Amino acid sequence: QQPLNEEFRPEMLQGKKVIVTGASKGIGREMAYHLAKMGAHVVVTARSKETLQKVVSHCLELGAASAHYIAGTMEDMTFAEQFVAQAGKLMGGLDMLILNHITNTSLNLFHDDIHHVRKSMEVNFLSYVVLTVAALPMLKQSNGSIVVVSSLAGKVAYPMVAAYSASKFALDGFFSSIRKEYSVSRVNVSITLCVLGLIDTETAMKAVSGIVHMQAAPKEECALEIIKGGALRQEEVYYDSSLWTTLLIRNPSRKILEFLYSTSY
Amino acid sequence: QPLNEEFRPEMLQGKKVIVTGASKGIGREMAYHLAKMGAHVVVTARSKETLQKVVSHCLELGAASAHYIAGTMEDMTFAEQFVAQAGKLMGGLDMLILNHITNTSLNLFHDDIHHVRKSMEVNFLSYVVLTVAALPMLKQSNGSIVVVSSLAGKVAYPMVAAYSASKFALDGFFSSIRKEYSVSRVNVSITLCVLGLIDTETAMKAVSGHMQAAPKEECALEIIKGGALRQEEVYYDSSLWTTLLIRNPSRKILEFLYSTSY
Amino acid sequence: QQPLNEEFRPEMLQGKKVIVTGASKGIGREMAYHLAKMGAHVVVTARSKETLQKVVSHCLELGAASAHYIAGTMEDMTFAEQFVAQAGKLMGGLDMLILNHITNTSLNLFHDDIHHVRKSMEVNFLSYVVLTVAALPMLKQSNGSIVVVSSLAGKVAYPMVAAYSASKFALDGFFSSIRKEYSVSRVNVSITLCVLGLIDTETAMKAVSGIVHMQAAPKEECALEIIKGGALRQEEVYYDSSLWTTLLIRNPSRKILEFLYSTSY
Amino acid sequence: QPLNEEFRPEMLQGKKVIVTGASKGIGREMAYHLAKMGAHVVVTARSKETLQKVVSHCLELGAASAHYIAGTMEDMTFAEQFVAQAGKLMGGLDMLILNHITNTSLNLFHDDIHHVRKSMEVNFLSYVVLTVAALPMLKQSNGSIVVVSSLAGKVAYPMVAAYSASKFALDGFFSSIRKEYSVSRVNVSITLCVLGLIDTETAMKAVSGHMQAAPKEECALEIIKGGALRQEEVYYDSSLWTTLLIRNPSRKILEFLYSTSY
Ligand SMILES: NC(=O)c1ccc[n+]([C@@H]2O[C@H](COP(=O)([O-])OP(=O)(O)OC[C@H]3O[C@@H](n4cnc5c(N)ncnc54)[C@H](OP(=O)(O)O)[C@@H]3O)[C@@H](O)[C@H]2O)c1
Ligand SMILES: NC(=O)c1ccc[n+]([C@@H]2O[C@H](COP(=O)([O-])OP(=O)(O)OC[C@H]3O[C@@H](n4cnc5c(N)ncnc54)[C@H](OP(=O)(O)O)[C@@H]3O)[C@@H](O)[C@H]2O)c1
Ligand SMILES: NC(=O)c1ccc[n+]([C@@H]2O[C@H](COP(=O)([O-])OP(=O)(O)OC[C@H]3O[C@@H](n4cnc5c(N)ncnc54)[C@H](OP(=O)(O)O)[C@@H]3O)[C@@H](O)[C@H]2O)c1
Ligand SMILES: NC(=O)c1ccc[n+]([C@@H]2O[C@H](COP(=O)([O-])OP(=O)(O)OC[C@H]3O[C@@H](n4cnc5c(N)ncnc54)[C@H](OP(=O)(O)O)[C@@H]3O)[C@@H](O)[C@H]2O)c1
Ligand SMILES: C[C@](O)(c1ccc(C(=O)N(C2CC2)C2CCN(CC3(C(N)=O)CC3)CC2)cc1)C(F)(F)F
Ligand SMILES: C[C@](O)(c1ccc(C(=O)N(C2CC2)C2CCN(CC3(C(N)=O)CC3)CC2)cc1)C(F)(F)F
User: Fold this and answer.
1) How far apart are CA B227 and CA B234, in angstroms?
2) Which loops or segments lie on the Lumenal side of the membrane, by the record (chains A, C)?
């Protein structure tokens, strides 16, 4: 797709209608807060109504045009599909879908745990496809945007996150393929894949907590960079504390192999 | 990590190898080459009758031995027991070649979740099930896992979204546990094969309607060598340009940087 | 250095005072014309007064705030040094120095021709150092800019241009080193190295003329991209007809090796 | 283009090698290693008396033979005749190791053109003069040119501008004629060495005032192996990171793309 040629401005999001999944904690809660401050309409979801209600309330205090939540688990494809309909009804439509939630995971060597690999595939990848299918009609109306949160470990290999990484790699293959289909079908819905390094969320800090030696990036600036890449219809957003990463992560060869195919049928 | 030496057909003689997806195409070609080198081979696929004919040409070609066990890799119980059966038959396992795929649609994606799920189950999740079932024996032999993949499991193409998800998922999963095995000192190698267009009957059916196609029998040999030599990646396309562009040295640099965290 | 954060606008060059060397033909003449159209003051040089006079006249018709030329050969270090003084006097100072000239060269296998290697070093590299030394006082006054025209063959290796390529590589080592010195000395003069693929100038078209199979880029758009990179104080400008080139030419590893040194004394 | 094999000291026994800049530092270490391997060696530098002592330790260490010819590489007539003299003395040339540099100032550049010119003459132009003089003999032996260079001849550093110009110029010139020799089928290899900080007395004098330094004697061996094995580049630094970052695979990809124009 083609990015907006112009600097991000907070106003771009005023009055927009935006779903954020996995928004009761961590990066998704910060995205909800940034959206509130921008005067957006927001619907947030996750499994926990109590934690969601606090986000909603804080969003209203922050200046959210409106804010609501709907709770359920993204293990359930029926919930996933219905949540989008309910959300689009609560707001009168949909400009941007931000898919962020993952299944609970911890760092461990992979041994035996196919159930964890399947659940990660289901919750972290397949639910995102089900949300996008539910959302696409409204997004076509609005010429909207899908934002997909992924990870450095959906681009390069690390130990201890085998199932997680499978699922983040799947999101790159899937949404990157359909982005190429949206170009040849003339569908004007952007797809932004967010590639994040370690971010200082509470779940992550608890797991890497003087247990593994690395520097975390701030979760609020992370959340705004995600929303910006989305608003400006960028293909990929990269966010990490290290400049080695930001310089070495892009893959110009892949872009050339894609262009060679793209230009010969 | 790789083998010092150049490939020699004798590396496989007497070796105990499973080949999945071996009724048709590249997997059939691998069964052949392995037989022509004197390996023990257990092959699998859904086509019982066509597997019979495959296992017989293998014996004709020199296999130390050959068996097939038919079933669908839609079924994780079957994937799991197939590996136990295949190991009893050979008294061990030196090499696990994972090659099967479910049938893929060259179509735009619209709303078929069922097909996305099934591609994931057969193209990816079965590979993990089989790997989990084969590891005890492969640890006992310092064996090899070979994982067959695709240009579309390294770069994005329209019309193959579910397939490319499943092929990218493989890279993520197997490249992670490869880091894991390096750190926990598991001496089982993992080779990922990245193939451009190969002239198999499946591919030639789907694309009929040019793209240059590489020889399925050369392809299948390249895969076995890669695995025999314990290489991380094998690339096989008919265009030298394509094989140049497939390498990702930034990724391998970044993975080194990141490992000093651990 | 730090680029201007903002889009190029033609106005940026209105009233600026700009030397262009090698400006009687090819890319440098186009740069002179682009500068004229922008309302800049320009002084152009090269060995040939007649061809220079035509450029000057055309520049005045195009809207040049002023335009003059001074002729001499850049084999002569005394000329080079004095030309800058004369030019800065003609204009009352100096905002931008564009070093562009090269010695006449053709495509040939290297055999025996040390004289050609030395003359290329002298004219294509050493004269640029002598111009920059002469210019630096005025440029410090103006917080000005040095623009250095180089080539893909000052970044990667081709046959048939051995001496030329030596000289273009030397310019990258020299000016890139002094750019790092300007950062630690707090000298606010930018240095832009222009890395060009085949451009459709008459001298080049004559040499590659159905003799070697390649696609040329347009010389006028090339010339404007050079001036823009300069005005916006970019470190490097890349210009080639091929997108393989523009994606693969940058060297993020070199930038990381530079940053690692830069941040430890 | 490279040699199939691993390095063996016997590759140099009986070999006819020039080493420039061999009075002091890395070039002295190379003269030694080459003697300890039984090469014929002609060494050069300006220090007559110190060259004498070098040529004598070479004989003690096992050289098939050893000579020095003293002169300054400021003088192109000398560079030229030195190679003829050195070849008569050995009856040929198998390897030309170009290693000398003029003395470098760690200072900011301000206005010293004379020093920029002289660095270019001694660090670069002399290398080309010597190469032109040595090529007939090297063609006759399928020999090797080895060109010693630096981090600062691949990336930019403040305080060494004239030196880095001369070291980048070498990369440009010699990498071009290397393409040229590939196309015109000249069977002389060209190796470019890219060195980080080495613990030579010169370097240790200049930087005294940390940076980790690599062993000059290991360094000098790495250079000779690279050249013996006919490799394009040799990289030698004490940090593995540094040696990872020095490689430029985009450049080598782009040079392939661009060669199909020709
Ligand atoms: N933090 C990092 O270092 C890092 C690094 C790279 C990428 N990322 C990506 O950033 C995103 C957010 O991570 P984060 O660290 O902010 O995570 P987090 O703080 O742990 O939040 C996870 C969110 O997902 C929800 N969730 C968990 N299981 C769910 C289920 N079955 N159904 C619906 N929601 C469920 C949780 O709420 P409930 O449990 O109440 O349901 C929570 O709201 C993820 O996609 C992650 O991969 C994070
Ligand atoms: N050929 C190409 O252009 C190309 C390009 C990139 C990658 N590759 C990769 O190469 C590998 C082989 O490809 P190919 O062209 O040889 O394909 P193929 O000829 O269609 O063979 C696929 C194999 O998988 C088996 N299979 C299909 N469904 C199965 C199921 N449910 N359970 C168990 N086995 C099943 C098939 O046998 P049954 O139907 O008898 O079960 C067949 O033996 C694949 O991993 C593919 O992605 C090929
Ligand atoms: N064209 C390309 O494909 C290409 C590709 C990559 C990089 N570049 C770079 O772009 C720049 C311009 O190239 P171009 O193709 O536009 O060249 P051009 O058209 O041949 O112009 C060369 C200019 O330099 C002048 N010149 C030659 N020898 C000189 C001397 N001794 N003293 C002063 N001026 C002298 C010529 O005028 P007089 O002879 O009258 O003195 C002429 O004005 C060069 O730095 C070149 O390396 C060009
Ligand atoms: N050591 C490092 O940290 C480092 C780092 C990067 C690259 N390198 C490269 O390694 C090579 C050797 O460096 P080094 O540290 O060994 O330097 P060195 O010890 O200073 O030796 C330079 C050699 O060149 C000779 N030389 C100096 N001026 C000469 C002249 N005018 N004519 C002929 N010979 C002359 C010197 O001998 P005389 O004075 O007797 O003439 C000496 O034998 C150089 O190419 C250098 O750039 C070294
Ligand atoms: C869910 C969870 O918070 C998580 C899971 C995966 C990631 C993740 O995406 N990360 C990459 C850096 C982006 C992780 C990759 C794994 N690192 C730790 C390790 C490392 N070597 O960096 C394996 C030890 C932690 C961050 C971050 C956090 C955790 F609980 F697993 F930590
Ligand atoms: C002075 C001259 O116009 C010239 C000299 C060098 C270049 C130059 O910078 N070029 C690189 C592409 C930017 C050349 C590099 C050499 N190519 C021709 C060759 C090729 N393989 O591309 C060697 C045959 C022509 C363009 C362009 C033009 C010429 F006369 F030599 F052509």
Assistant:
1) 8
2) 6-265
Cα C15 to averaged position of ligand 3 atoms, centre (Å): 26
Q: How far apart are CA B20 and CA B95, in angstroms?
A: 11
Structure tokens at A212: 């593994």
Structure tokens at B215: 């020889």
Identify whether the C-beta of residue D180 lies closer than 8 Å to the C-beta of residue D133.
no
Please provide residue C41's backbone torsions phi and psi, each rounded to the nearest 5 degrees. -90, 140
Q: Fill in the amino acid letter for B149.
A: S
Tell me the residue length of chain B: 262
Asked if C243's CB is within 8 angstroms of A259's CB, the reply is: yes
**Burial (Cβ within 10 Å: 0-12, 13-18, ≥19) of residue D10:** exposed
Thinking of the domain B1-262, which architecture would CATH place it in? Answer: 3-Layer(aba) Sandwich (3.40)
CA distance C48 to C51: 6
Separation CA D128–CA C155 (nearest Å): 20
Residues D231/D190, Cβ–Cβ less than 8 Å? no
Q: Is C25 annotated as a binding residue?
A: yes
Q: Which fold has domain A1-265?
A: Rossmann fold (3.40.50)
| Phi-psi domain of A220 (left: phi exceeds 0; alpha: psi -120 through 50; beta: other) | alpha
Sheet with C236-239, side-by-side order of all strands? C66-71, C41-46, C17-20, C96-99, C145-151, C190-196, C236-239
- Cα–Cα distance measured from residue D28 to residue B232, given in angstroms and rounded to the nearest whole number: 41
CA distances (Å), D217 to each of D4, D191, D213, in order?
A: 25, 19, 12
SS3 of residue A98 by DSSP: strand
Residue keyed to tokens 């990258």: C172
What does the alpha-carbon distance between residue B29 and residue B54 come to, in Å, rounded to a whole number? 10
Query: Is the C-beta atom of D45 inside 6 A of ligand 4?
Result: yes
- Whose CA is closest to C194, among C163, C157, C231? C231
What SS3 class is residue D41? strand
Distance CA A58, CA A34 (A): 11
Give the separation between CA A262 and CA A265, rounded to whole angstroms. Answer: 6
Chain D residues touching residue B244 (CB < 8 angstroms): 253, 256
Among D179, D217, D219, D225, smallest CA distance to D196 is for: D219
Structural contact between residues D23 and D201, judged by C-beta atoms closer than 8 angstroms: no
Q: Is the CB of A27 under 6 A from ligand 1?
A: yes
C36 is known to lie in a ligand binding site: yes
- The rounded distance, in Å, linking the Cα atoms of C253 and B254 is 11
Q: Indicate the helix (H) or strand (E) that contains D162.
A: helix D161-183
Q: What is the Cα–Cα distance from C133 to D162, expressed in whole angstroms?
A: 14
Burial C20-44 (b: 16+ CB within 10 A, else e): bbbbbbbbbbbbbbbbbebbbbbbb
Q: Count of alpha carbons within 13 Å of C109, Cβ hemisphere only?
A: 12
Resolution, angstroms, 1 dp:
2.3
Q: Residue C160 carries which DSSP code?
A: T
**DSSP per residue, A128-169:** HHHHHHHHHHHHHHHT-EEEEEEEGGGTS--TT-HHHHHHHH
- With the CA atoms of C102, C103, C105 and C110 taken in that order, what torsion angle do they form, in degrees rounded to the nearest 10? -100
Nearest residue on chain A to B184, alpha-carbon basis: A109
What distance in Å separates the CA atoms of residue A43 and residue C102, rounded to the nearest whole number? 63
The reply to whether ligand 3 has any atom less than 6 angstroms from the CB of C103 is: yes
